[PDB]
Design a protein around this nucleic acid. Structure first.
Lengths: 53, 47, 53, 50
DNA sequence: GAATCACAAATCACAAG
DNA sequence: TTGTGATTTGTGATTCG
DNA sequence: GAATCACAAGTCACAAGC
DNA sequence: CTTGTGACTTGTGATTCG
């Protein structure tokens, strides 16, 4: 989407313990943290702020 | 433990600013929740 | 250290399974791949090539 | 077989140089050495994993 | 995983045998 | 005609990254 | 095939304002 | 203080070079 396609990334804070779990996971299996964050965040929005996306 | 930093898609971060400005809250709250709800949904094992 | 504070990085390619071990260990117990590369290589040069340090 | 793929990593510049000169001088390449140093690290500190 | 060294074996070539 | 030297070409081993 | 590059992910440490 | 963020570091697939 235009706004996704074109805009950049933006730094955000997160609970370390939650973060760490994800980092361990990705180190083991595939992927990377941002990837999961972006999904986690998207799924939040689609559920709690459906119209905004 | 405390906080870690993550870069996320600016178009989503945008949506969250607007909302937390308009109704209550802050960006960190949403992340913390979003991640916990994700981790529960897909990696519940990790207790 | 002055020399060491402005010291840059070269990139090198290592066996994947070795990398994967480090990826996992660091993600669990802190540190990062580069940190480990540096220590590993210094200890090796110190071991077999002490002149060059 | 022990065919195995690779992964790019960073190393401090001066150290890489010391290898690049020694291997240039008396044969070998950096990749070999850089692997050997890594394997030996892993045996020192993470032998279980090896 | 191509380029360039280095060296062996075809290709030629004029002259003598 | 055919043996010697000069000459070019194919190719396996080797360098550079 | 080793070596290097450049663009993405990840972290840091000052900035804003609670 | 806690939270927000741009500058900087680290990570690594893509690309070069021969």
């Amino acid at each position: 989407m235009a706004k996704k396609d074109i805009m950049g990334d933006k730094t955000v804070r997160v609970r370390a313990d939650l973060h760490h779990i994800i980092k361990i996971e990705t180190a083991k299996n595939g992927g990377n943290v941002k990837e999961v964050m972006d999904q986690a965040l998207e799924e939040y929005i689609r559920k709690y702020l459906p119209d905004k996306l």
